[PDB]
Structure 1
Amino acid sequence: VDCLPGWSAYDQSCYRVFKLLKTWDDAEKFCTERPKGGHLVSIESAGERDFVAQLVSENKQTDNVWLGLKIQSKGQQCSTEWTDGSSVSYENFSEYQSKKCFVLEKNTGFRTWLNLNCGSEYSFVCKSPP
């Protein structure tokens, strides 16, 4: 309930939208370095979704913003079979083409999650304990 100046309280956690363009790894790293620690925001309830969407809109973000969701895979991508039944034994996506890191979509008022290149530069939301 008692957050640092600039941060907003929801359900016992503190939240803040940072208007600095970072890649997903740099934003996550930034969030871990806040005084009470923390991470890029996670969204675990309809309540949190709505709170974070309003927070981001209140801050007049005009592009997508990172959240803390990421694809974890063995290879470059997730499909294991081509249409002809054969195995995926070779992959050739560039890093620009890989889409493993999720944003809140500006086009939905920051309510829905889209996977995009991790090296994209976007503002982001951090979540910390008070």
Structure 2
Amino acid sequence: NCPLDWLPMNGLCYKIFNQLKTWEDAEMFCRKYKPGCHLASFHRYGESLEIAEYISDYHKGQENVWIGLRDKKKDFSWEWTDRSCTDYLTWDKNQPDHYQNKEFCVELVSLTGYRLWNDQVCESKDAFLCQCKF
């Protein structure tokens, strides 16, 4: 059960925000939105499609979207900000790759209908997917 403008999915609620922010700020906005929120985390193929479809339908934009997967210790060591060990990974073709050794934040590729992930420059200004418990 969630607010009517959020996507209910397996116990949690999701929502894309169209305000562009770096990954760091996206996490902080979700965190400061309401207590118990973070950038979204995925844990099963089913959710990726559901979220992708939802974003495609409600994202008032065309820009990619930040999710809660960032490689803190720079070396393909990703963790979910919602503290739920990485047990799922639907990486896009030829991704990740730390392009120029300056990309450690996963984003949903808009070209892939948001069905494929991609390591990105955390400083990039994308839209983001918050996830909350209400």
TM-score band w.r.t. shorter chain? 0.7 to 0.9
Query: 1:99: which partner in 2?
Result: 103
TM-score, normalisation: structure 2: 0.75
Counterpart-to-counterpart distance in 2, 1:5 and 1:33: 20
CA RMSD of aligned residues (A): 1.9
Query: 2:69: which partner in 1?
Result: 69
Deviation at 1:63, TM superposition (A): 1.6
1:124 aligns with 2:121: no
Q: Percent identity?
A: 34
Partner deviation per Cα, 1:25-58 (whole Å, 9 max, x = no partner) = 1000011112242110001001111111011100
Amino acid at match of 1:104: L
Query: 2:114: which partner in 1?
Result: 110
Counterpart-to-counterpart distance in 2, 1:78 and 1:68: 17
Q: What's the secondary structure of 1:72's corresponding residue? A: coil
Amino acid at match of 1:113: W
1:78 aligns with 2:82: no
Deviation at 1:59, TM superposition (A): 1.7
Aligned ranges for residues 38-57 of structure 1 at < 5 Å?
38-57=37-56
CA contact (8 A) 1:97 1:117 kept: no
Deviation at 1:97, TM superposition (A): 5.9
Amino acid at match of 2:123: G
Paired positions, count: 110
Counterpart-to-counterpart distance in 2, 1:13 and 1:42: 10
Partner deviation per Cα, 1:9-38 (whole Å, 9 max, x = no partner) = 111211111010000010000111122421
Query: 1:17: which partner in 2?
Result: 16
Counterpart-to-counterpart distance in 2, 1:122 and 1:97: 19
Q: Which has the larger radius of gyration?
A: 1
TM-score, normalisation: structure 1: 0.77
CA contact (8 A) 1:50 1:111 kept: yes
Deviation at 1:103, TM superposition (A): 0.4
Contiguous gaps of at least 5 residues in structure 1:
80-95
Q: What's the secondary structure of 1:25's corresponding residue? A: helix
